[model samples]
Structure formats: C-alpha cells, structure tokens
Target: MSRDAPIKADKDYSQILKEEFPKIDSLAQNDCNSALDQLLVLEKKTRQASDLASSKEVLAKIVDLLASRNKWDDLNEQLTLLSKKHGQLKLSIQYMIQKVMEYLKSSKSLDLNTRISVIETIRVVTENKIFVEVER
Candidate 1:
C-alpha cells in the first residue's frame, strides 16, 4: 500500500509578498537593476506556487520598473527570461505581453527600433499559442 501526501496551505506566498514588495520598491527608487534582480527571485517563487494574481503584478512591476529607467534592452531580456522560466503560468505571460504592448502604445517618445524589439520579444514568446498570437 502507498500513502499519499496532503496538499499544504500556501501561506508563504503572501508572506513573501509582504516582506519583499517594499524592499523591491525601495530598491527601484535608487537601483533598477538590483530591483529587477530581486523581482526575479520573487518571480521564481510565485511562478512555482502558480499564484497568477501575484505573478501578474510582479511581471507588470518589472516592466514598469525597467521602462522607468529607459532600460528597453533589459526589459526585453527580462521579459524573455520570465516567459521561458520553468513552470511559468500561461496567463501570467499573456498578461505581461498585453501590458507591455499597451505600454508601448502609451509611450510616445520611444524609438521605432525599440518598439520593434519589444514586439519581437512578445512575438517569439507567443509563437505557438493562438490566444497570445492574436495579441502579438
């Protein structure tokens, strides 16, 4: 006979958010790179927990944080990295791509190359998925 393991409550997700959100904010004020690094760590945990709401928020925060510093290259890289992360929620990636596409529309001063670069990043990630492909 085999025993089955019980599912445990995921209370740590909220605790991680509580403790890390403020630190991410403070870091963003002075160091965007460091903030992104910390966010990546947080993203890993949230993705593993399949916390869609939290993951969406974190992904959007990452996009905004990078854009605030005019770090388009870094934003592209991070988006790719996050999308390819093991066990990343599909909804989270979809939301992130939509958010960035909207951000691109609203930011009027961005160069054409930068805009294309962002689009290309989303295109590659959404390649095989029709739901996200339509948005691309």
Candidate 2:
C-alpha cells in the first residue's frame, strides 16, 4: 500500500496581526508594558519569518503605543532592544528611526529634554549608518 500524503501548515502572520493588533491596542490602554511584551513576541515571529512588511508595521506600532502613553523611557529602551535583536533587519530599524523622528517633529507638546533623549537614542542606534547619522 502507498503511504498517504502529509499536510504542511504555516502561520498566516498577516491574519495573526489583524486579529491581535486590536487586542493589543485595548491592552495598551490599561497595561502598556504588557502590550509591549505581546508586540515583542509578534516582532520576533515576524522577523524570523522575514516578513518585512509585518515587521515594519510592528515596529511603528511599538513607537506609537509607547508615545501615546508618554512612555518615553520605555520607548527608548524598546527601540534599542529591538534594534539589537539577533538577525534584525537594517531597513526595519531605519524605518523605525524615521518614524520616531517624524513623531518628534509633529509632537509640539514634547519637552526639550525628552526630545533630546529620543534623538540621542536614535544616534546611538544609527552609529555606523552614515545616512541615518546625517538624518539625525
């Protein structure tokens, strides 16, 4: 007798995000840190799958979530951590830095000290990237 064919299944990352992002948004309302934890997991999965679009989306959401709650310190820490993750994509990090810069530019309510710290964080992360350094 011949053996039966086996089925192969892979996660649908876009679908996962569609369902999960709303939940994370709700969670961020009361528990920002915990919501960040969920994003970190999704980030790792999406990055490992080499899903550039999803990864970029998650990175932007991380910044927006932290910024919405005025968690500047947490935002800095998370950005640094995400930039250094094993096998992280250079373009995604660059995109994230750009998003933060845009956020800073549009947010007039941010204090000088906070803005400086955010810029410093981006500088450190962009260390060897001349284009981003110049952008900074």
Candidate 3:
C-alpha cells in the first residue's frame, strides 16, 4: 500500500504514525543526523534554507491523531502552554524542514532516526530559542 492512501486528506493517524514511527529509530545509535542537518540549515545561519515547515501539515495531522487517540485535552493544554514558543520560531525553520523532507523523499536520504532527530531538533530550537533567526 502507498504511504499515503485512502480517499481522505486525513488517514488513520495511528496507522500513519505507526508506519512512519520507525523513521525516528530504525537504526542503531538512534542517530537523527540528516534531520539535524535540515534543522541547522533551517535555522538559517548560512545562505541556504531547505524549508522545514514541511512539518506543519504533518503536525496538524498528528494533532488530529492526538485528539482521536483521546489525548486532545492534554494536548490542548500543552498547546495553550507552548503556542507562544511555537510562534516565536522563525518561519524559515519550518520551510527548511520542508526542503529537507522533500530532499529525503526524492533522494531517499532520510532514515527513521533522522526523522526523529530532525523533529527533536525543531522541538529544542522552538522551546529554548537556540534557533536565532537572522534577516536575509
């Protein structure tokens, strides 16, 4: 079956999460370097940005999964607490992540740990402000 299937914009989330979950831990050392690269690029320190915002739609879908799996209240509470931090992130971050994801899908450069690592990097950058955005 295709990774994306069915006649719906929203697929079975658990299944979606399940199918892709390994993308974060498929290899030993639990390394997520590729994702991290995209994160670094997305933070926009250099001349290139790959577009990590690719996660937005996926995150929205995950939020739906959270609700479907009965985590809505808790997740909503988390959103209430964390929404500000999420907004503070430079838009470039997500955009770069999108580029990284597209590169991976096109070149088969992404691994499970890479995905997780990339996501975790984003989480850290967003929560801690380690990601400083510069005007280009």
If ranked by TM-score, best first, what sequence of candidates would result? 2, 1, 3
- Model 1 global lDDT (CA atoms, 0 to 1): 0.61
Tens digit of per-residue lDDT, candidate 2, span 1-136: 3657664444455666777879977897778777866765676677666764566567666556565556555556555655654654455556566657655434547787877777676666656564434444
Q: Residues 1-136, candidate 3, lDDT per residue (tens digit)?
A: 5666666644432343344445544531254444333322222321122232333334433333333333333232222332333465444444433333333322334455644544454455444433345443
Higher-lDDT candidate among 2 and 3? 2
Local lDDT at 114 for model 2 = 73
Q: Rank the candidates by lDDT, best first.
A: 2, 1, 3
Check candidate 2 and list the clashing pairs. Answer: none
Model 3 ranges off by over 4 Å: 1-89, 105-109, 127-136
lDDT of candidate 1 at residue 24, scale 0 to 100: 68
Query: Least accurate stretch of 10 residues (summed lDDT) in model 1?
Result: 127-136
Model 2, poorest ten-residue lDDT window? Answer: 127-136
Say what the RMSD of model 2 is. Answer: 8.9
How high is each candidate's TM-score? 0.57, 0.58, 0.24
CA-lDDT, candidates in order: 0.61, 0.63, 0.37
Candidate 1 wrong stretches, greater than 4 Å? 1-12, 48-54, 74-93, 104-108, 130-136
How far is 36's C-alpha from truth in model 1 (Å)? 2.6
